[PDB]
């Protein structure tokens, strides 16, 4: 069947992008970043 | 219809949303979050590499100073110091300490671990043994920096940083009715329903119940434990508050001044948290409704003393679960299925990646109807997807991860009781 | 906008947005029920809404048609096929050409800005615009199908655009929805303690998702596809008041002749049927034909049933009996021969196509019906039925009115002639006027006028004992002080 | 392409400018079709990384072609219907008031009463218009053209263009038959989750060729393909009428199908109970009882071929064929039976009894009669009749593009015109039309009379009540410049 | 004679897609049988074309 | 692909359908060992079969 799969939970394969199924993805969605607080 | 007495059925119970955890809406799977860590040394991606700032962490009071051009010895278990020297230290907890020796004097032989060696040296420090220092270098040696005058071996230390990201990914949950044509009908003549519709409330209920249940357990599976070592009285029964031991209210009676001995404790908690996070102290309280109770029914501002009924702060777990704000600061949430009696405290900022937990949906309660023709009985169920995370950073005891890759999903070893957004206290003696 | 959803759309999606926080801003606060009167169909959200993005609406949506909509697209289907019969169909054409009038050398439905306005500069922009509306609708020859859709179907709409390379002057041709494919929502985007009272700017938006892959007629080869989700601003839209007991499934006026609608077509074909049937001969042989096979019985069958059936037909293309010459004999000859020793062979004949009617019951359903779709009973001077519809058809005016008024203010407030809050202080009266029947409302000014008339006549002897003159036209002719002395003066002129 | 198809090469290249005008605008972010009525649209969805576009040809041809089938049906319905009693004349008067004609009358005549570019223009235009009139044969056949329109539901013509020096070489149309044309409009555009662009459609047209015999259907076939030609190419109108949905055009007199056909299957029935069992009715049985159908067969000729009667009506001349005289004081019947049992005798029918009371197939009659969209009035003034002028005067003005079309066609062409200044005219450069005046003059009339009484009942007052200006522009109906114009007519005739 | 295709996909796939690239992909998986079907078919023409 | 750009179609309103033709044949025999046809593009007429 048209399975698209998923990915290992590999976070390599994640980040690239790579399934086991049919359809790889293009990459992750960027939620942001982060910096530290300067201290006082 | 022989006198029908009407029906019953249970209620369903609240829950505590997202209120003190990130939400990140997603619009696709498998999100990322990256982060830059301040490092020096000239090699940002490294073993041994140090970062700029932390929040449990003093900085190299002498990199840019004195260290440049020398070494410092360092303390180690059995060494004996030189008065007027100075001995490096790098602690498991305020990281980077010079001190000069005021004395001649060995430190605990006996010491294995660095939890020991960082005791007696404390105790050296106390003593006024050790003492803390540092100074810039002397402006004869800088002057040949780089290698002027013939000179050699005098680079200036360099700074730069490391970015890096962690990733995560969802997972999923389904749910099934599996009813009957026949037991609708009745139901129909017997109390007017549809009974799917009942069912799909069931299914999308349970399945939201779940997933609070399951944020509020990330929540307490990855905090860190409270009145522990900076918060710790050292008379204490190590992570847990009691009403029937003097040691944690400070030989309070009278429940009028005894009850704010938890308040105390809890500021303290939220204060270390901060400590933890570099953000701010905790604004964010869930705990047993057993605690609540007492809360509510303690004055919690500043006075003499006082007592009465549990008024302060809804207390029922029948219309909210969300109690109300403490003395004006922390929100309190209650924990309904609380095991044992206890806590959770913790800090969530304004910006949502400011969390330590995050929740992140990409897919939700997707209905799904069909019928098995075998049969043609109905088929009816829900699908949702969503994926939860943890801050970078929020270990905080390791400067850094391995590979400039991780997952940003939770695990053990990610996470297991080392979250520095949130702190867990035991509740007894109520 | 947390993702550019639909892009496309953003510049419509910016006017939703500002309205939105707008609401929130103001103390639009502490109301018990959401602060909806009318239109679209309500739904809640949590505190903080945590029901974003589109696949959250896509919930909403589901939740709205299947147990929902899918009802109202029924009912929409339902007023096609009720105007898809006769003595329908006409009492819409009625109301239609008395809703808007078409006549020669004269004006359409138009904008009149008699009322206060910053300048005369401003309201001849404001009337240019109103005409590029109905420019864009060509609202002048196709304005009767605009209004005869709406409120046949009880709802217009249509979709709005903006450049987007030049917003500013950015609204062009309106295109109309095509009916059933969308829906649309108002989200109560705010939860308490137990039943929230506050501000929700409630989204106001709306979602498109038919497919041709399942017919509720054939033939059709387009349609919305999947679910999109596009701002309130986007369109311009109405409908009538008319609910039923609960929820937001909108119905037309037509709805309350659905009942005798379908009960005179019922009792129409029953009619015809009961009249229809039995008008030729009718009649059963019974033969005797026993001990035998049907193999070899049916010989016997045959040798009846091919000699006395009158094997022909009456042609109903020319009124002539099929091979029947010469046309019609003074008898008809059959005969059968027994076998059994009893007279048991035989044929019957059926009742026939009689006529027993007293056919009224059919009239008076009639006559219930034409009333229930919303006719003046003067048809199958001046009266009461047309003074009420007088007023009914200038309701439906008002209402449908905003499909002008929409497009007008958006185009204005788009370009920057007039602002927001002028607008709302504005109207009040920025009001559309519609033409009416010159013919008629010379007729019913000339009634009016040889009443005053005949009662200025008969207070005539009076006037200088107990009526003053300037009485008599402010009570008789029903004259202003100032029309009074308008006349005077008038009259002055004349006579020199 | 090639433009194998060369006899439309100059309307080809009217379409490619079009085209790209729509190609040009910013008519995009629409969901709609943006489409009301006419051409029927499609998901030829393409220009796209997806190409859905191929399922709608295989659809389109796959399924060859319930639309144009559907339309014949339609249509040779609404024929058959006009071919009936009342519907006939409820067209007949219906074409003749959309077009009245008479001797040295007012056609349908193009007023360009608004601004243009110049007095030069109007004439030219005025002129083609005369032309394109001409072309249609408009003052014999213009009645023609609009029944087909009103009872087909549209009618349209194929334009022909020299094509050598194409913007001069301008002929007449040729009036295309119906059922032969089937109008369309593709999708040709896509985009995120469907598309939301500009859909030009090209609104091109494909004509089926057919060759009908005596067949009065495509009885064995129509004639193979059929072409698809640019619309600039294609002269055509219709009445706004439709089924539920779609752009199932349906005809004026299809609101009325369904009791016409009532009406003519209730009528059959009258007739068939009247003229069924008219004659004598009667069965004779013969009693032959335990006979071998060898002998019971003969025994049943005994009485069938020898009591059998001899008459018959001579509908040419009302006689009793070969019956001399006319009738007999009796019938003399006699049989004999093998016993004292009523088996061997003869039982009579029921005859052509009377029932109506022809209330009910007049009570549809009557309902079918309006629904031909006539006046009851028919088998002074009233609102009905009004309404009718208003009716009349639409159908006229839907048919109207019939002239519009061809008109701008030429005038643009030859460039008397521009395109832009067509759009800008028109806005409104009507045609106006003859109306039957014998009709309008009575009107006229009445609304005087009318005028005048309420002027005369007022009289009294008007030195001291209502004022001249006031009368004339509120009882007689006068403009202001009317009211001069009158005042100073009169200065002269005074003289 | 007779000739039929199935698509048989996932339902999370074509979540996914319509995240990823903007395709909810069932129109794609219908198109592509549709397609294949007319395509196979007019090829099957040409061939009895040849054979006869 | 060439759709039926080159061939007929008289799609079907049952499965399954049927066709037929008429020859014109002579020598009073519709089916006969060496009957002939009257037209047929291959085959010269008899011309003396209406006539010597």
């Known amino acids: 069947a048209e399975i698209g799969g998923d990915h290992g939970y590999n976070a390599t394969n994640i980040a690239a992008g790579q399934t086991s199924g049919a359809v790889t993805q293009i990459g992750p969605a960027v939620m942001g970043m982060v910096r530290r607080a300067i201290p006082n | 219809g022989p006198a029908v007495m009407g029906m019953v059925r249970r209620a369903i119970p609240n829950l505590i949303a997202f209120d003190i955890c990130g939400v990140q809406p997603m619009n696709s799977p498998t999100g990322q979050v990256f982060a830059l860590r301040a490092v020096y040394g000239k090699d940002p991606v490294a073993a041994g590499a140090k970062e700029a700032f932390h929040p449990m962490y003093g900085p190299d009071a002498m990199f840019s100073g004195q260290g440049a051009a020398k070494k410092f010895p360092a303390l180690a278990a059995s060494t004996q110091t030189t008065v007027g020297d100075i001995y490096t230290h790098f602690f498991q907890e305020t990281g980077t300490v010079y001190l000069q020796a005021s004395v001649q004097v060995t430190i605990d032989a006996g010491a294995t671990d660095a939890a020991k060696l960082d005791a007696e040296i404390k105790k050296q420090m106390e003593a006024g043994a050790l003492v803390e220092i540092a100074e810039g270098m002397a402006t004869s040696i800088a002057e040949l920096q780089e290698g002027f005058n013939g000179s050699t071996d005098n680079p200036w230390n360099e700074m730069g940083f490391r970015i890096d990201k962690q990733v995560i990914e969802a997972k999923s949950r389904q749910l099934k009715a599996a009813y009957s044509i026949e037991l609708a009908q009745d139901l129909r003549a017997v109390h007017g329903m549809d009974a799917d519709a009942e069912l799909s409330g069931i299914l999308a209920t349970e399945i939201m119940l779940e997933i609070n249940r399951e944020v509020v357990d990330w929540i307490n599976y990855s905090a860190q434990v409270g009145k522990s070592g900076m918060t710790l009285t050292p008379g204490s029964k190590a992570g847990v508050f009691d009403f029937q031991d003097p040691i944690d209210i400070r030989g309070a009676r009278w429940a009028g001044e005894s009850f704010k001995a938890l308040l105390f404790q809890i500021d303290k908690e939220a204060v270390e948290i901060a400590r933890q996070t570099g953000r701010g102290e905790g604004n964010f309280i869930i705990a047993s409704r057993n605690v609540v109770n007492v809360l509510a029914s303690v004055d919690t501002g500043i006075s003499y003393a006082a007592q009465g009924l549990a008024t302060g702060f809804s207390t029922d777990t029948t219309k909210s679960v969300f109690a109300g704000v403490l003395g004006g600061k922390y929100r309190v949430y209650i924990d309904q299925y609380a095991k044992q009696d206890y806590f959770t405290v913790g800090y969530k900022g304004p910006n949502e990646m400011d969390a330590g937990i995050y929740y992140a949906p990409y897919v939700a309660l997707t209905p799904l109807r069909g019928s098995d023709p075998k049969n043609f009985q109905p088929v009816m169920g829900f699908k949702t997807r969503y994926g939860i995370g943890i801050n970078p950073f929020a270990e905080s005891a390791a400067q850094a991860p391995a590979s400039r890759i991780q997952s940003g999903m939770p695990s053990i070893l990610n996470s297991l009781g080392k979250n520095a957004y949130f702190r867990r206290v035991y509740v007894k003696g109520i | ?479 202003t002080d100032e029309e009074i002395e308008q006349e005077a003066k008038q009259i002055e002129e004349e006579s020199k």
Not at chain 3, 197 to 220: L, M, N, P, Q
């Open chain 3, 1 to 479: 906008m947390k993702f550019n959803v639909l892009s496309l759309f953003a510049p419509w999606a910016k006017m939703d947005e500002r309205n939105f926080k707008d609401q929130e801003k103001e103390d639009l606060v502490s109301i018990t029920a959401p602060k909806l009167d009318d239109g679209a169909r309500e739904f809640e959200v949590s505190s903080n809404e945590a029901a974003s993005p589109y696949n959250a609406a896509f919930q909403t949506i589901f939740g709205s048609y299947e147990p929902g909509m899918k009802t109202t697209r029924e009912l929409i289907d339902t007023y096609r096929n009720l105007m898809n019969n006769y003595e329908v169909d006409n009492a819409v054409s009625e109301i239609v050409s008395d809703a808007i009038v078409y006549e020669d050398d004269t004006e359409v439905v138009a904008l009149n800005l008699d009322k206060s306005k910053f300048s005369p500069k401003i309201k001849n922009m404001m009337l240019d615009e109103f005409s590029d509306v109905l420019n864009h609708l060509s609202f002048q020859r196709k304005g009767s199908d605009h209004f005869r859709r709406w409120y046949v179907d009880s709802r217009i709409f249509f979709h709005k655009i903006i450049d987007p390379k030049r917003p500013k002057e950015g609204i062009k041709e309106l295109r109309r929805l095509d009916p059933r494919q969308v829906q649309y929502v108002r989200e109560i985007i705010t939860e308490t303690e137990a039943g929230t009272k506050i501000v929700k700017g409630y989204k106001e938006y709306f979602i498109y998702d038919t497919a041709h892959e399942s017919y509720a007629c054939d033939g059709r080869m387009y349609e919305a596809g999947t679910k999109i989700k596009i701002p309130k601003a986007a369109v311009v839209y109405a409908h009538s008041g008319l609910v039923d007991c609960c929820g937001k499934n909108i119905i037309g006026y037509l709805h309350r002749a659905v009942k005798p609608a379908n009960q005179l077509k019922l009792l129409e074909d029953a009619v015809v049927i009961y009249r229809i049937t039995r008008a030729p001969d009718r009649r059963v042989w019974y033969v005797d034909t026993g001990n035998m096979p049907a193999r070899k019985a049916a010989e016997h069958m045959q040798h009846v049933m091919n000699t006395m059936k009158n094997r022909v037909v009456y042609d109903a293309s020319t009124g002539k009996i099929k091979n029947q010459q010469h046309n019609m004999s003074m008898t008809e000859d059959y005969w059968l021969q027994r076998r059994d020793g009893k007279a048991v062979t035989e044929v019957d004949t059926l009742p026939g196509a009689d006529n027993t009617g007293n056919m009224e019951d059919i009239r008076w359903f009639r006559q219930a019906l034409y009333m229930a779709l919303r006719v003046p009973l003067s048809r199958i001077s001046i009266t009461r039925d047309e003074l009420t519809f007088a007023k009914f058809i200038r309701e439906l005016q008002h209402k449908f009115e905003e499909v002008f008024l929409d497009p007008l203010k958006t185009n204005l407030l788009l370009k920057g002639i007039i602002t927001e809050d002028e607008w709302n202080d504005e109207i009040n009266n920025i009001k559309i006027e519609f033409h009416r029947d010159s013919y008629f409302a010379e007729l019913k000014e000339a009634e009016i006028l040889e009443r005053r008339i005949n009662m200025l006549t008969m207070a005539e002897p009076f006037i200088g004992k107990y009526i003053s003159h300037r009485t008599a036209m402010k009570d008789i002719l029903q004259m």
